[PDB]
Write a protein that binds this ligand. Structure first.
Ligand SMILES: Nc1ncnc2c1ncn2[C@@H]1O[C@H](COP(=O)(O)OP(=O)(O)OP(=O)(O)O)[C@@H](O)[C@H]1O
Ligand SMILES: Nc1ncnc2c1ncn2[C@@H]1O[C@H](COP(=O)(O)OP(=O)(O)OP(=O)(O)O)[C@@H](O)[C@H]1O
Ligand SMILES: N[C@@H](CCCC[NH3+])C(=O)O
Ligand SMILES: N[C@@H](CCCC[NH3+])C(=O)O
Ligand SMILES: [Mn+2]
Ligand SMILES: [Mn+2]
Ligand SMILES: [Mn+2]
Ligand SMILES: [Mn+2]
Ligand SMILES: [Mn+2]
Ligand SMILES: [Mn+2]
Lengths: 485, 485
C-alpha cells in the first residue's frame, strides 16, 4: 500500500544523490550487441568453446531481475531483442562499483554492461561483467486491463506476448510492401486533408485551415485520388496509410485505422480475388511459417481457396426460412429488414435494405475466409456495373473471423454514370443519409479524360493483423488505440 | 476556340454510338507487358533476330499519337512504363476493325493491342498488331501553370519529367526503409489524432470526435509517442508519415507533409550526424547513381562531410558586423533582432531571440549541406541539456539549399527537467505563444519509468525529395499539394 510510495521516495533520494555527484543522466555508453544477437550466435556453444573464444561484448537495457548473493550477483537484462544474463562480481568490476553503485540501483533502472561471454551451470548464455554502469535511474518501479492501452509502454515492458504482436505487425507490413512491389505496384502518398471527402460512406472528421479560412475533412479513404493517378498513368499504385472516420470505438473499429488501397489497370475483381488469396497465403507462410493459422478456436487454411458466395446466397444460408422473393420487393424487404431489428431510414432503397439484411444476417457467420459478391449498385457508387444485371456491381468484400477484412471491385470508369451516381448520393444526403458521398466534379472530369478499365482493392490492415497474431480486439494490434477520456 | 467544343461533342457522339452497340466500357482485355519491359529486353535485337524470335505480346495504354497513311497507320502507345510503337494495318487486324473502329478512335483513348515484335526502319521497337481494341473512350482531348497541381493527372499524362520526379520519390522512400531496416530499426505507426498535441511547436488543426464528444488535434509530430515506445523497449524505431500544421502554404511548406522520425537508444546527436551523412550518401549513390547531385545552379557532394557550425558561428559568418556580445544581453539581442526586422514577442526570452536572429540572418545562406549545432534550451523543450552549458542543448538542425531539411538531438530523459520545461511552455502560451507546447503529464510519467539515453532525428521527406529531383518548390514533389480555393 504505502510500500509503493516508499519505492518512489527511495528512487527520488537516490537520484538526488546522483545529481550531487554530477550529471545524473549521461549519454555516453555504447553497446555493440543486443540479446537476440548473442543468443543466435552463441547459444549453441558450450563453456569450453566460449572460454577459448574469449568474446567480449557490450549490452544495455533494463534491469529486470537482480539476485544479490554477497560478493556476486545475477541479473536479467532486457533489451530490444529480449533478455540476457549478467554475472556481476565485486572483484570483476572496478573498485567500489559493485558496492557503492550496483547494489544501490533498482529494478527498472536502465544499465549498461561490458564483459566476456560464457555459459552458466544451467547452460544459459551469460556475460561475466568487467564494467557496469547506471544509464537512467527509474523513478517508478517496474509495472482495469485498460492500463495496457492507456500506458502501452508498461505493457511492452511487462508482456512479451504483446511485444511479439507488434513486432509481427511490422513484419507483416514489410512483407506486404515486398509482395506488392514484386508485382510492379508503386507506393504513393495522397492527401489526408481533403476539401471534399469521398471514396467511401462514412461520417468524416472536420477541421479548419486558418490560413485559407477553409473548412476541411480528414480523409475517409484515398480512393478518388488513387484513381486520378491511374488516369495519369500510374497504372499499378498502392497506398498503405491512415483513414479517419467519425464513428464510435469498438472491438474492430478505431477512429483512425490503417488501410491499404491498391489499383491495377487492365484487371477486374476476379484478379483481385486471386491477389487477395495469394497475399494471405504468402503472408502466413512467410511470417508465421505455415499456411494454417490458429485464431481463437478456429484454424484458417490460407493454403486453400476462400469460400465464395453471392450476397443473397449468404443471406439464404444463414436465415434459411427467408423467402428470397422478399428481397425483390421494397415493401417486403423493408418489412423483412425491420423484423430482424434493422431501422430502415427514409433514404434507403431496396439495394441498401438487402445489404443491411446481409450485414445483420450473415456477416458474423463468415468465420472461414469468405468472399461475398454481387453488391447492389445503390451501395456501390464507385463500382463498375455488372454487364447482365445493372442493379448489382462487379464488387465483393471478404470476411474472416466474422469480420470484414477487405472491399474490392472492378472500378467505374464511365464518367456519365459516375456523375449520376454522385447525384443520387447527393439526393440521399438531402434525404437524411449523413454518410452519403459528396459530389466531386473534378473526379468526374478526371474520368472524362479516361480511366483505363481497372480493379481496386481496400484491405483493413489492423483487422488483418488481428488474424495473424490471434488478437480478438483491434485494440491489441494498434500501439496507441483510441480510448475514452 | 470552338474547336475544343467540337472535340467534346464528337467524343460524346462516338460514345453514344458505343452505347448502342452494347457495353461501352468493357473490362476484359489483358496485357502481359509494359513498354519499359519490351525496350529493356528487345531494344538490343535487330529485325533479323526479332523476326526469327517471332515474339507476340499484349500491351495497353493511352493513344498519344496516330498517323493514318491509308491502309497502314503508326501509333504511339503510352503506358505506366513509357511509350512503345504500334504498327496498325487494315489487313493485319480482323476484318472491319481497322476502318470501322480504329479510325474512329481519338488521341487520349485507352486502347489495347496484341502483336508481334519487330524493329522499324528507324530502328525503333514496334508491335505489328494482329488485334486492337478500344478499352476506354476519352471524352476530353489530351491536355496558369497551377493547373499542373489542380489536375495532377493531366500533368502526369503530359510531362514525363513530372512522372520521373514521383517515381524517384517512391524509390527514395523505399531506399530509406531499406537503409533503416538494415540498421535494425523497426517501423511503427503512432496516432495521428491526439488529445494533447506535442513533439514540436506549431499551430495544430483541431477537430471533434462526436462519439466521445471530444475535441482532438491532428498530430504536429509523433515524437512523444515514439519515445514512449523506446521506454517500452523498442529501442530502434522509426515512423515515416504525415504531420499536420495549421500554417500557410509556401514554396517549402504544405499544411500536411511527410516526415521521418527515428530514435535509437544508447546514442547521442553525433551518431545522428553520421547516420544523416550516410543516408544522403547512400540515397544519392543508390538512387541517382552518383554522390554529386546537381540542384539548381549548385552541386552537392554527398560524398564529403556536411559543413558544421554552431548557431552563433553561422550568425557571425553571415552578419560579420554583429557584436556577438549582443547575443548575451536580452535588451541588446532584442534590439539587434528588431533592427533586422524581427518582431519580438513578449513571451520570447534570449534563447528564442538568438534563434530567430539565426533564422533571419543565416538560414538562407546554408546552401551546401550544413549542420547547425548548439540550439538554446528555450527553443528545445524536449532536448538533452548540454553538460557544460545548461543554456544550450545537444541538438542540431541541418540545411541544404537554404532550407531546413532535418532536426535532431540527444533526447531529454530527465523527467523532472522535462516537467519543468513543459511548465515553462505553458507559461509561454499564457504569455501569448500560440505555438508553445501543451503539458503532457502521461509523457512525464513515461519518462519516470525510465527512458534510455537516446538520440532522435526528424527529416522532412518532401524537402529531401526536392534535392534529389532538382525541384525548387515543394509543390513539385507532393502529388496533390494543398491549393488556394
Ligand atoms: N473503424 C475502423 N477501424 C478499423 N478498420 C476499419 C474501420 N472501418 C473500416 N475498416 C476497414 O476498412 C475497410 C474498407 O472500408 P469500408 O468502408 O469497406 O469499411 P466498412 O464496411 O464500413 O467496415 P465495417 O463493415 O467493418 O464497419 C473495411 O473492409 C475494414 O477492413
Ligand atoms: N509545412 C511544412 N512542410 C514541409 N516540411 C515541413 C513543414 N514544416 C516542417 N517541415 C519539415 O519537418 C522538419 C521537422 O519539423 P520542424 O518543427 O523542425 O520544422 P520547422 O523548423 O518549423 O520548419 P521551417 O523552419 O522550415 O519552417 C523540418 O526540419 C522540415 O524539414
Ligand atoms: N475505398 C474503399 C476500398 C477500395 C474499394 C475499391 N475501389 C473503402 O474505403 O472501403
Ligand atoms: N519532433 C521534431 C523532430 C525530432 C526531433 C528529435 N527528437 C520535429 O517535429 O521537428
Ligand atoms: Mn462501418
Ligand atoms: Mn461492411
Ligand atoms: Mn465495406
Ligand atoms: Mn516552420
Ligand atoms: Mn526552423
Ligand atoms: Mn526546426
Amino acid at each position: 500500500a504505502i510500500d509503493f510510495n516508499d519505492e518512489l521516495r527511495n528512487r527520488r533520494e537516490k537520484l538526488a544523490a546522483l545529481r550531487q555527484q554530477g550529471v545524473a543522466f549521461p549519454n555516453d555508453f555504447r553497446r555493440d550487441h543486443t540479446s537476440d544477437q548473442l543468443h543466435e550466435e552463441f547459444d549453441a556453444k558450450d563453456n569450453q568453446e566460449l572460454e577459448s573464444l574469449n568474446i567480449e561484448v557490450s549490452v544495455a537495457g533494463r534491469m529486470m531481475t537482480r539476485r544479490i548473493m554477497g560478493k556476486a550477483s545475477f541479473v536479467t537484462l532486457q533489451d530490444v531483442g529480449g533478455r540476457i544474463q549478467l554475472y556481476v562480481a565485486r572483484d570483476s568490476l572496478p573498485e567500489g562499483v559493485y558496492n557503492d553503485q550496483f547494489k544501490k540501483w533498482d529494478l527498472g533502472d536502465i544499465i549498461g554492461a561490458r564483459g566476456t561471454l560464457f555459459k552458466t551451470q544451467t547452460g544459459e548464455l551469460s556475460i561475466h561483467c568487467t564494467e557496469l554502469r547506471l544509464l537512467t535511474k527509474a523513478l517508478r518501479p517496474l509495472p482495469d486491463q485498460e492500463v495496457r492501452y492507456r500506458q502501452r509502454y508498461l505493457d511492452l515492458i511487462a508482456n512479451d506476448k504483446s511485444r511479439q504482436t507488434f513486432v509481427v505487425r511490422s513484419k507483416i507490413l514489410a512483407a506486404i510492401r515486398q509482395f506488392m512491389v514484386a508485382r510492379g505496384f508503386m507506393e504513393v502518398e495522397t492527401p489526408m486533408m481533403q476539401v471534399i471527402p469521398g471514396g467511401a460512406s462514412a461520417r468524416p472528421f472536420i477541421t479548419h485551415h486558418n490560413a485559407l479560412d477553409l473548412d476541411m475533412y480528414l480523409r475517409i479513404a484515398p480512393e478518388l485520388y488513387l484513381k486520378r493517378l491511374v488516369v495519369g498513368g500510374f497504372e499499378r499504385v498502392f497506398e498503405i496509410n491512415r483513414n479517419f472516420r467519425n464513428e464510435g470505438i469498438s472491438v474492430r473499429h478505431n477512429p483512425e485505422f490503417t488501410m491499404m488501397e491498391l489499383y491495377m489497370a487492365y484487371a477486374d475483381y476476379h484478379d483481385l480475388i486471386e491477389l487477395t488469396e495469394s497475399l494471405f497465403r504468402t503472408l502466413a507462410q512467410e511470417v508465421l511459417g505455415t499456411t494454417k493459422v490458429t485464431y481463437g478456436e478456429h484454424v484458417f487454411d490460407f493454403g486453400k481457396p476462400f469460400e465464395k458466395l453471392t450476397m443473397r446466397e449468404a443471406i439464404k444460408k444463414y436465415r434459411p426460412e427467408t423467402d428470397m422473393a422478399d428481397l425483390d420487393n421494397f415493401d417486403a424487404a423493408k418489412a423483412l429488414a425491420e423484423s430482424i431489428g434493422i431501422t430502415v431510414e427514409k433514404s434507403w432503397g431496396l439495394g441498401r435494405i438487402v445489404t443491411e439484411i446481409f450485414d445483420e444476417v450473415a456477416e458474423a457467420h463468415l468465420i472461414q475466409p469468405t468472399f461475398i459478391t454481387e453488391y447492389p449498385a445503390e451501395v456501390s457508387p464507385l463500382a463498375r456495373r455488372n454487364d447482365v444485371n445493372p442493379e448489382i456491381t462487379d464488387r465483393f468484400e471478404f470476411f474472416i473471423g466474422g469480420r470484414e477484412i477487405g472491399n474490392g471491385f472492378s472500378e467505374l470508369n464511365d464518367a456519365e454514370d459516375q456523375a449520376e451516381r454522385f447525384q443520387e448520393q447527393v439526393n440521399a444526403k438531402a434525404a437524411g443519409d449523413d454518410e452519403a458521398m459528396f459530389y466531386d466534379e473534378d473526379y468526374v472530369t478526371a474520368l472524362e479524360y479516361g480511366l483505363p478499365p481497372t480493379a481496386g482493392l481496400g484491405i483493413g490492415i489492423d483487422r488483418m493483423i488481428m488474424l495473424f497474431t490471434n488478437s480478438h480486439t483491434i485494440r491489441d494490434v494498434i500501439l496507441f488505440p483510441a480510448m475514452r477520456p
